[PDB]
Design a protein around this ligand. Structure first.
Ligand code: A1CB9
Ligand code: NAG
Lengths: 270, 105
């Protein structure tokens, strides 16, 4: 799934952000001064020639700043009240699935379907009046359609091919154990940290021997700036039963050689 | 009503080892509107050079940001993340949890 996101915050203090994404991985940014498309990796160009890239830059210029101006010119009659934020996400995926959705104040507001903008029902007549503005040029809607059903599939195809090496790399996790901060009385919180792995799918469990401890509470998977991932898995146990416990990590990159760490040494303490 | 309060999670890139360079992270997510102020603190004092990722949002339109800095911990230093947002009565402070050791000689 490649998509472009647009974040526009209005205070009439302002802010305009455009960036491109392969799911979790950022691949493009729009520099708000050079009006250029900055490529965050060598392979961010996909198989798109430099001149087709200047074409794309032309259209990102014109539509980003006509969209900001249009939003601010119509805000009165649309009853957009300051401060407010507009968010847009558009791109393509199954098989050739495409999408373009717009939110106002963090809620579904309008979306683009085939050839025209449609309001989400719950968003009311305000969203309906917005579609009128959004639908004032059928040709501009036809351009949007072709951006979604033509340009985006070809781009994502070239992008995935160009980036296959980076996207399918295997980075081994490291792990470590610590005491968790808020155990109940008479209990300990054992924490198993897993960091530096890629790609995202991972397995981590506290164990007693070969028995998985179902009390294991996995946290969110969190990002690092270097593009790898982080996870904390905790287990609450009675202080008497923390001996034979270990943390076991399985990951594609380890090829069956699980990381296994043992609650012990000064962690008991012996 | 339409506002969402930030979740704040603090973690290190590598295990804490005194005198070895490391990276401290503060992941702020699930908030709306996007205006937010995030500081990394060392012994209660703001750390001058901190970076963050480009602002993004999830499927449910809530925003998220990663803040991080390179640092070298010693056994005496405490680190934290301090977040202020319209949803918060007062800045919320989440500490970096590390063991440190030497519970008693
Ligand atoms: C950094 C990442 C880079 C990596 C990318 C790599 C490859 C990615 C490729 C594909 C990936 C997915 C692509 C996503 C698709 C992009 C989303 C769509 C972009 C915006 C859509 C349209 C924007 C726009 O154009 N709004 C213009 C419309 O204009 C109007 O139109 C009419 C004609 O023209 C005129 O009416 C005329 O008036 C006269 C008098 O009445 C007569 O009556 C005429 O008869 C009558 O026609 C109007 O004047 C004129 O205003 C307006 O300003 C504004 C509307 C306000 C909001 C605009 C859209 C909302 C925001 C959508 C996204 C914004 C930016 C996203 C990224 C570009
Ligand atoms: C880029 O390469 C991909 C390979 O998956 C191809 O499908 C796509 O059409 C190409 N795009 C071009 C040549 O613009």
């Amino acid at each position: 799934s490649f998509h472009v996101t647009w974040i526009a915050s209005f205070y009439n203090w302002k802010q305009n952000l455009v960036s491109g994404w392969l799911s979790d991985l950022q691949t493009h940014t729009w520099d708000s001064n050079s009006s250029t498309i900055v490529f965050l990796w060598p392979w961010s160009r996909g198989n798109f020639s430099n001149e087709e890239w200047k074409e794309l830059e032309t259209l990102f210029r014109i539509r980003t700043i006509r969209s900001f101006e249009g939003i601010r010119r119509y805000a009165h009659e649309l009853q957009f009240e300051y401060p407010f934020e507009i968010q847009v996400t558009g791109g393509c995926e199954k098989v050739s699935g495409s999408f373009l959705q717009l939110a106002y104040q963090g809620s579904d507001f309008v979306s683009f379907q085939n050839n025209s903008w449609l309001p989400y029902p719950v968003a009311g007549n305000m969203a309906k009046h917005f579609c009128k503005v959004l639908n004032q040029n059928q040709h501009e809607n036809d351009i949007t359609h072709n951006l979604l059903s033509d340009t985006c599939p070809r781009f994502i195809l070239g992008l995935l091919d160009a980036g296959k090496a980076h996207l399918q790399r295997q980075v081994k996790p490291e792990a470590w154990l610590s005491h968790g901060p808020s155990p109940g009385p008479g209990h300990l919180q054992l924490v198993c940290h897993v960091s530096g792995f890629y790609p995202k799918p991972v397995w981590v469990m506290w164990m007693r021997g070969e028995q998985e401890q179902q009390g294991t509470q996995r946290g969110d998977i969190l990002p690092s700036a270097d593009g790898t991932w982080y996870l904390r898995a905790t287990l609450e146990v009675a202080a008497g039963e923390a001996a034979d416990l270990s943390c076991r990590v399985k990951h594609s990159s380890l090829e069956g050689q699980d990381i296994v760490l043992y609650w012990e040494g000064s962690l008991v303490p012996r | 009503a339409i506002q969402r309060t930030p979740k704040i999670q603090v973690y290190s890139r590598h295990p804490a080892e005194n005198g070895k360079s490391n990276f401290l992270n503060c992941y702020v997510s699930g908030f709306h509107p996007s205006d937010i102020e995030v500081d990394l603190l060392k012994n209660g004092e703001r750390i001058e050079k901190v970076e963050h990722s480009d602002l993004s949002f999830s499927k449910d339109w809530s925003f998220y940001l990663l803040y991080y800095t390179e640092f070298t911990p010693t056994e005496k230093d405490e680190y934290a993340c301090r977040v202020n947002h319209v949803t918060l009565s007062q800045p919320k402070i989440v500490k970096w949890d590390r063991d440190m050791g030497s519970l008693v000689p």
